[PDB]
Nucleic acid binder design. Sequence first.
RNA 1: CCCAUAGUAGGCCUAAAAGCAGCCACCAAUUAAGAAAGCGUUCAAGCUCAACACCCACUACCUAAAAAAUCCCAAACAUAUA
Lengths: 222, 75, 154, 72, 162, 38, 45, 75, 96, 175
Amino acid sequence: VKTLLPVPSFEDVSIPEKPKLRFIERAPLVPKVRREPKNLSDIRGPSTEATEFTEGNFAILALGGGYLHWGHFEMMRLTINRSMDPKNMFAIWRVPAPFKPITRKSVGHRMGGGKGAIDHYVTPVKAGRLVVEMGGRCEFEEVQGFLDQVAHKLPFAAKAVSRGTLEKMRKDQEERERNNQNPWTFERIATANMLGIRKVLSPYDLTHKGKYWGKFYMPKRV
Amino acid sequence: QCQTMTVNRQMKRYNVPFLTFINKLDRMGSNPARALQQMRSKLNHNAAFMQIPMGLEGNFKGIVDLIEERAIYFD
Amino acid sequence: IPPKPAIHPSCLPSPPSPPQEEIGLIRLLRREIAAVFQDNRMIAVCQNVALSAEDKLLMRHQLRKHKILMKVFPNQVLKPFLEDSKYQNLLPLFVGHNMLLVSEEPKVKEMVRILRTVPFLPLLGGCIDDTILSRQGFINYSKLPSLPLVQGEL
Amino acid sequence: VQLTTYAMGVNIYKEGQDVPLKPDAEYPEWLFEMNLGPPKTLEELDPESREYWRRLRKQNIWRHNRLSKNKR
Amino acid sequence: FREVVETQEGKTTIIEGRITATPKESPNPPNPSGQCPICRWNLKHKYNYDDVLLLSQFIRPHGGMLPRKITGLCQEEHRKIEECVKMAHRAGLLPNHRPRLPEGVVPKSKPQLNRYLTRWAPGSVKPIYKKGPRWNRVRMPVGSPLLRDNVCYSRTPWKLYH
Amino acid sequence: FKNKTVLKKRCKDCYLVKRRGRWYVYCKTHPRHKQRQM
Amino acid sequence: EALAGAPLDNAPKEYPPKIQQLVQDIASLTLLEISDLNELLKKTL
Amino acid sequence: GQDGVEDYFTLYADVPLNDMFGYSTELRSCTEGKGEYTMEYSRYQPCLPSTQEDVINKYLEATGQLPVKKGKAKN
Amino acid sequence: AAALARLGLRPVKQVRVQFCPFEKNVESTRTFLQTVSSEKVRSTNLNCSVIADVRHDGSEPCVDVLFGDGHRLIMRGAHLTALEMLTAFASHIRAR
Amino acid sequence: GVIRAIVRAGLAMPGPPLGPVLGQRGVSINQFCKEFNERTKDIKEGIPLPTKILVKPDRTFEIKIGQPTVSYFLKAAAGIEKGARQTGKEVAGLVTLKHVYEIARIKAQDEAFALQDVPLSSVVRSIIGSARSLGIRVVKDLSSEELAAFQKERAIFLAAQKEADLAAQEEAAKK
RNA sequence: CCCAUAGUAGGCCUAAAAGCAGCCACCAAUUAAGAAAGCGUUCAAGCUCAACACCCACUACCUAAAAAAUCCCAAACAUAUA
Ligand SMILES: [Mg+2]
Ligand SMILES: [Zn+2]
Ligand SMILES: [Zn+2]
């Protein structure tokens, strides 16, 4: 015979109103008459806000930088609304509406004449930022499944993690970073300026510790 | 088949006596017993037997009458 | 660079696994086994035939018509009870699929005559009032005369 | 048009007189010790009964069914 | 060991089941605390593919092998023996461990091409016609990926792709 | 056969085999599930 | 305390010793003890 | 609905006339001969949007075939 | 043991098994009798039957089978397992 | 083998469900229907009951008559003809313990219960669970209480059926 | 590696949807099986899985490869000691 463990009871998680995701529009309620440059520092480096959870216990953890326009948000919201349970699951958006303007000139035009016209709008997303958060009274297999299904469709690398999974991954990351055999850490060489390496490196590498490069994220750099 | 069943329905509804003749017995697909069993089961007729072959596919030579016990050797 | 251990963990003797705590299912199984073994005096272990449930309910109704019951138990919970108690000579008879009979009062004639109708229902034997016997033992014991005359012949 | 519609015109007494209804004295007492509305959970049955283990097995079956929904 | 014996006598096939004798392990192991037959003799990362005596004790006379529940190997040690035995039947080793067949060894097609360290099957790999440029050259594999933790004496890692 | 990078079983009778350097998905009940590794 | 070796009846070679002891105890007299046995047997049944 | 007799059944269908171009051919080919059917006028129902666009395009081609379709197909 | 049901069991005539309950080498013949007396392998033909003979002083797990060709096959499972005798009976009933 | 079929007693016309299956099996259908009718003519009510048939390889069918279903008995004891779409928020009716006890003691003689050591507690628990899953509700033994219950339930169920028919007509009109 | 009976056609527009069209409660019998966890079903049949009975190896390091035009390019060695 085999043992029969008690099933996890779900009685402290109540589903609020509007379990489905809200509609995301293209341009905001007021257009920006001043054209802003394409500041690339909004996606380079670790994320500051929207890192931990808030209401749900499952969220998609980003592992790279990139821009998401109206089509990506529409695809994500449609997939969520078509692959969920409205009486047992509910998701809340974590990223704001796209507001960064992008200027595009005419096709087949000479170089010059100032900037072009504003077409669409995107939003900056850094590494380690939760894209969408979803909770409810379900378990972990199905939610991880239909969240990785969408994360594989995202341009940047993303995985479906939770609370315990994030805790375990942070624990093994710090365990690997505190038990290094070779005594030559990237941070020790970058901060103390060894062998004149500061000539070919970058001032942003002092805070990144060699864990970021442009927009990607290597979790095996240590 | 279908047309045979329709002709049978008409002939039985107007009461017409008839006798069955089997043609083309020179190919690799001669089996009067199967056709007779079909006429017995699938249709509502009666059993009968009047001729016996002496070789099929490529051995057809004559037929028997089994009424006078005297076969026929066609030449 | 991961730490390289001097001795691989798969080579050194692994520590013993912690024994699991016994659940209530096996406790209730052992309790009801002891209960049906103390009150009932006639049991007959027979090889369970992997037949359809239709014939199974048919034979169940044919047996229970003569005011008898039937109840089986898994070998995992039965072997300790057979090896720790007095029935230590019945442990080699529970090594596979089998069916145990729980019938109150001795009525071996009717059950044998109703089971011999099918030639695919064998039985390993059983005990008749603390007297272990086999199939041939049962078929030669069912031919014994009535109880009153055997009691009064002395 | 065929349908099994044999609803007898029962008012307030046709359900006890049409059939040989027996009083409460002739019926045994242990027939009223059954459940009524809500069923039985897991914290209302002692772990020394078959009903608790059957309920736990049913809950485990339900959990396995809810889990095995995406895998093949 | 155990073998099957079938005899024909008067249209009555007599299928018997006689159990024969078999040797055992030496009553003096160097490391009795080991959990694997290879670890108990201090042969951890100490054997190669040329050892025809070690590989012949865990295989079948007809070319087959033995599971882990019978031998006693773990997960990483059973795969090494499974890879080293495949490198022996191709290099001409173990001539008595050939599979049984009726009468198929009649037309000797391709002659006995000598080979060693054969990792993949001969009649299956595709000939490399392009070989790539220079930096991303497609080398030919050799050896075994599970035989990298063995003891070396040449002060250089085992080059498996050259 | 169909060229597929990620192979998977489409029903129940599909069994995976390793032949001529490629993983093939053969099936006798539903022959439409034949896949070929590219 | 377990049980017996579970013999069979197709090959009569062994018998329980208690039956033999009881028979040896009750089969060594004349007729007065037989009459007493009949009396004590008919007292109940 | 569906009726039936001793040997076969009798289906009660409800199919528009627009989808009755070659129904007899496929109905026979999917019945092995012994299948028949009867057709009679029933009522009217709203039209499907695909057939709506089809009849709109047909009326457009019949009236004036140069508003967009053949107007851009030729220039 | 579905191979015996997919193959066939029509030409067989009568089969039987003999073993002892108190022996420790009678599980093979026991599971063989259990598999041969299932549902598909028993309903695939109605012209055959089985005999379950249980003896005490047999001291031998012999299984004798025979089919319609007048042959005879007796296999004693003293040391053989269940799969071996199963595939042997399958091959013997398929080849003849 | 066996074929599960639940048809009406006095209404067993050759065709629906029991038609293509009986035609492809290899047995007759008109003779089976005639035998079922001549066996069920003893019933003076036409109660639909299940039928367990068995076919042998020599093409011959047998009929074993058993006990009818439970939903029909529950609907006859409650008084309603059709079941409700909800349970708890829309009760169809009330049935006392005496009616379900009589139904259980009458049904406990079929081929499923008479061939098993099942007591009265098990069958009354099963019928109580079936009544709870149907849409009705059981109660101790309420004489005058169930009288007043029926007196109010007639009116409330008439109102519920009227409003349900109105909602269905509205949904049919919105089309 | 094996294995599957029943209270039923659980409640309802559509003729019915009988385990996969929608609703709150998703009952209940012997050891043990979901008013339904994956295909074929106008309404029924055909197949597996979870649950007994039965033994009980790893029951899974997660996913990370590609083909253009004169012709592909040096060759070779996993085993005598940094
Ligand atoms: Mg079914
Ligand atoms: Zn080891
Ligand atoms: Zn397939």
